[PDB]
Curated annotation (Swiss-Prot), chains A, B:
Catalytic activity: an organic molecule + reduced [NADPH--hemoprotein reductase] + O2 = an alcohol + oxidized [NADPH--hemoprotein reductase] + H2O + H(+); 17beta-estradiol + reduced [NADPH--hemoprotein reductase] + O2 = 2-hydroxy-17beta-estradiol + oxidized [NADPH--hemoprotein reductase] + H2O + H(+); 17beta-estradiol + reduced [NADPH--hemoprotein reductase] + O2 = 4-hydroxy-17beta-estradiol + oxidized [NADPH--hemoprotein reductase] + H2O + H(+); 17beta-estradiol + reduced [NADPH--hemoprotein reductase] + O2 = 16alpha,17beta-estriol + oxidized [NADPH--hemoprotein reductase] + H2O + H(+)
Cofactors named for this entry: heme
Gene expressing this chain: CYP3A4
Consequence when changing R103Q: In allele CYP3A4*8
GO CC annotations, alphabetized: cytoplasm; endoplasmic reticulum membrane; intracellular membrane-bounded organelle
Localization annotation: Endoplasmic reticulum membrane; Microsome membrane
Protein name per its UniProtKB record: Cytochrome P450 3A4
Pathway assigned to this chain's UniProt record: Steroid hormone biosynthesis; Cofactor metabolism; retinol metabolism; Steroid metabolism; cholesterol metabolism; Lipid metabolism; fatty acid metabolism
Activity control, per UniProt: Activated by cytochrome b5.
Disease in which the protein is involved: Vitamin D-dependent rickets 3: An autosomal dominant disorder of vitamin D metabolism resulting in early-onset rickets, reduced serum levels of the vitamin D metabolites 25-hydroxyvitamin D and 1,25-dihydroxyvitamin D, and deficient responsiveness to parent and activated forms of vitamin D.
Length: 438, 438
């Protein structure tokens, strides 16, 4: 029934099926479907997640309007995700004024100053990562990257969020598809006390927090925060910590795997990066905060990897009122979507876009890139609150790992890398590479 | 789970049962439960329709704050009623800016000027009401009032809304209880294309409207309206007409029955009213617009009946943001309720409140009544848009009916009147009275 909307608005798009919309086109993933629609339709098109109208926009002025200019007024919130339980109080899920408050209380936590104070604790677990890598390098047995990296990613998380310090390494799915064909079942589950975050994990940390709270990182800065608006609660403080672990876990690890695959399949870039790391940090010097920002080619590698593998795939905002933006009428309730992956690989902006070419982000060419076409961390008042931390975290990992080791493909290394057909931006097969000691 | 809210806020109220809240206390009706809570708790108290927190307020300053001062900002909408289908576009159901637009387009329809132009068409069907009454008066067979009145109420509706002219007389229930224990099933039904307004009635009028629309009252003024904002649609125009029929049907008839019962059980008031009607309209003169407003004692009878029988029972607003009003913090999502029936019978404001005493509204005493304690039509920007029309409609009915007939109780007349234990403000048994010709 709601499938007449875009037709009335005269916006092109694939014809929807009843009770499914256009969801059957997700068989090749969000990304392939985004690019095919970008090609066949042009600057704007609509489709239907079930009965939910989604409007893709690709014009950077319109993207700036949505993500920045009209954020507070119209496009404040992401599409209603649930069932979430108490995790409704987490910042990336909260809406309107509740989010606007949580953002203010959590923004000073992620300042450049606090991040610098976090570097030495991040610095220690690289040595763990190095020695755990050196144990597998002596063996030579080819390495699955998501393990060794995911262990390191966990080491940073538990340390940077709760002062807990562990050697972790030594110590489009069925449901969410059913969500968009039966989103009238979200409130069904909120009264059923079900949660996509098992009622045990949240229970574990909810009481684990109040142990550390009353026995005495992010938890510190957050506890210091609740010392205008209305300060911070105790259940809310737990929810944010959970959203920080989830955030920094499968993102820090996934990107670092994407980088090692790209460095291995481009040994020249690996050498030029190893040259820059050795020059600024002679004798495998311990990386510091300021030296990390000093390395431009390392930043060029990171951004180029994030261009080919934007973990988020898309950016979304719920249109809370009828609005006109840059000549286009958009009705209330519509989900406006910015196809990040499809823009990061648009030939109309990127020369040879399928190729890993760090020199696009050279200090010369970094000026030609539109910040509303390249958006690995989103943009506007509701961008990645942990952008600077994530970049610092990953760069500190790459530096110490390239001071000691070089990485070579193995016969099992999936060349070229095929992405996961599911709802996650991940490789089909895990990245397996050879680790050689310098 | 949501049952901890008021406890935290320190607001008193009945202790709720799981998965039911306090709904089992509706066995004696909304009204009896409201008065019992007013007595036992005082100025403010909360309770739970299932998991839904409802906050009753009784302080007129707070009532003015909710209904008037903070209407546009915070308390714009009534509690989400559904499943409604396309009737979501009807004004009494619409929310926020959509309602604010529908109100503007429909406000000039209900001006005092247009109402005066509607009187002669309303005047004609009183003669129908009189002659249909005279046929039953010759017989004398005691009369059930909701029939004869409901027929007249229909005659006004179809005439005042579509120019259709008929002699109609000659031509807390199970579901909504399940609504508040399973309100997570409202979106379940919106996708099931079910409706509490059968898919045939709405279908009947939706196509019946476009017949009269393309062949060529309220429909006229509305059609003239769609000739800023965005004008009016065709489906929306039908929805409003349906909400006008529903409005003016069981309300015009229910109140007029409540008035005849009260006039019959108080023959003195009936005589003093018949005296005023004869004096201003000698020789049973045809009532005019201006003469109706000239009659003060008739207005006193109407208001006093509406004090004892406020059809709406309660007034409700959904609190769309966290707010403080007159020293009381109110969290988001709470339903703020104004117990009209319980305030209209509060002895702390009304001397001998159970008694039918029109002299409370005498030009002398009408000054002492607080318009935030007496609210038969609500108050503020979202009051009864059809207040003036309804009063004019009912007064024109009473005048011509009292110029010709007098009304006496019968042995079957339920003295005293017992109200319906359900969710409607209606009598237990229908009102049966004796009709004598003057
Ligand atoms: C490579 C690493 C990361 C990438 C590429 C990334 C990217 C993004 C993107 C695209 C968004 C959505 C922006 C928008 O919708 O406009 C976002 C939001 C967010 N990110 Fe990240 N992120 C990364 C790491 C992190 C880390 C380490 C944290 C640690 C707390 C974090 C916390 C958040 C939060 C809380 C939000 C939601 C903010 C809000 O809703 O106000 N992210 N991120
Ligand atoms: C004895 C007759 C009537 C009584 C006692 C009455 C009373 C009320 C009350 C108490 C409200 C709610 C006010 C609030 O929540 O603040 C209301 C709203 C409303 N009434 Fe009436 N009413 C009567 C007749 C009518 C008639 C004849 C119409 C014809 C159109 C009508 C149309 C409406 C509408 C559309 C609303 C909702 C307005 C909005 O939501 O913006 N009513 N009425
Ligand atoms: O789009 C999708 C897929 N499918 C659907 O949602 C639909 F239901 F439709 F099927 N997932 C997300 C929205 S939930 C995501 C999971 C989460 C985890 C713990 C607690 C609560 C919630 C969350 O909120 N934070 C993650 C932290 C992060 C990760 C990466 C970068 N920065 C921060 C989209 C998203 C991505 C990035 C930022 C914000 C939102
Ligand atoms: O409260 C309750 C009972 N129970 C519950 O709602 C809960 F779901 F919770 F169980 N019903 C109403 C809210 S629906 C009511 C029905 C209706 C009819 C046709 C099309 C759509 C909707 C409507 O909207 N208009 C009526 C027109 C009117 C009648 C009388 C005076 N003026 C106007 C409360 C209400 C009363 C008065 C004005 C506004 C709202």
């Amino acid at each position: 029934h709601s499938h007449g909307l875009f037709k009335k608005l005269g916006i092109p798009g694939p014809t929807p099926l009843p009770f499914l919309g256009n969801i059957l086109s997700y068989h090749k993933g969000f990304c392939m479907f985004d690019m095919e629609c970008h090609k066949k339709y042009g600057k704007v098109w609509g489709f239907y997640d079930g009965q939910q109208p989604v409007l893709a926009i690709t014009d950077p002025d319109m993207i700036k309007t949505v993500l920045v200019k009209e954020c507070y007024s119209v496009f404040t919130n992401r599409r209603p995700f649930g069932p979430v339980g108490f995790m409704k109080s987490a910042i990336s899920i909260a809406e309107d004024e509740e989010w606007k408050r949580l953002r203010s209380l959590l923004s000073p936590t992620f300042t450049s100053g606090k991040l610098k104070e976090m570097v030495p604790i991040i610095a220690q677990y690289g040595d763990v990562l190095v020695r755990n890598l050196r144990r597998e390098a002596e063996t030579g047995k080819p390495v699955t990257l998501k393990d060794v990296f995911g262990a390191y990613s966990m080491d940073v998380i538990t340390s940077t969020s709760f002062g807990v310090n562990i050697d972790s390494l030594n110590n489009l799915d069925p449901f969410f598809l059913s969500i968009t064909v039966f989103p009238f079942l979200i409130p069904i589950l909120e009264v059923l006390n079900i949660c996509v975050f098992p009622r045990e994990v949240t229970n574990f940390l909810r009481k684990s927090v109040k142990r550390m709270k009353e026995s005495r990182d992010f938890l510190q800065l957050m506890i210091d925060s609740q010392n205008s608006h209305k300060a911070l609660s105790d259940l809310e403080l737990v929810a944010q910590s959970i959203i920080f672990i989830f955030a920094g876990y499968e993102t820090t690890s996934s990107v670092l795997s994407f980088i090692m695959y790209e460095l291995a399949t481009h040994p020249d870039v690996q050498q030029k990066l190893q040259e820059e790391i050795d020059a600024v940090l002679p004798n495998k010097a311990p990386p510091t905060y300021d030296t990390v920002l000093q390395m431009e080619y390392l930043d060029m590698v990171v951004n180029e990897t994030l261009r080919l593998f934007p973990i988020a795939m898309r950016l979304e905002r719920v249109c809370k009122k009828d609005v006109e933006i840059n000549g286009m009428f958009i009705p209330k309730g519509v989900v406006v979507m910015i196809p990040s992956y499809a823009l990061h690989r648009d030939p109309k902006y990127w020369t040879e876009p399928e190729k890993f070419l760090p020199e696009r982000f050279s200090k010369k060419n970094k000026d030609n890139i539109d910040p509303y076409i390249y958006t690995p961390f989103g943009s506007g008042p509701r961008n990645c609150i942990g952008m600077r931390f994530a970049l610092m975290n990953m760069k500190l990992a790459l530096i110490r790992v390239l001071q000691n080791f070089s990485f070579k493909p193995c016969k099992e290394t999936q060349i070229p890398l095929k992405l996961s057909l599911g709802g996650l931006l991940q490789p089909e097969k895990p990245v397996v590479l050879k680790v050689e000691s310098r």
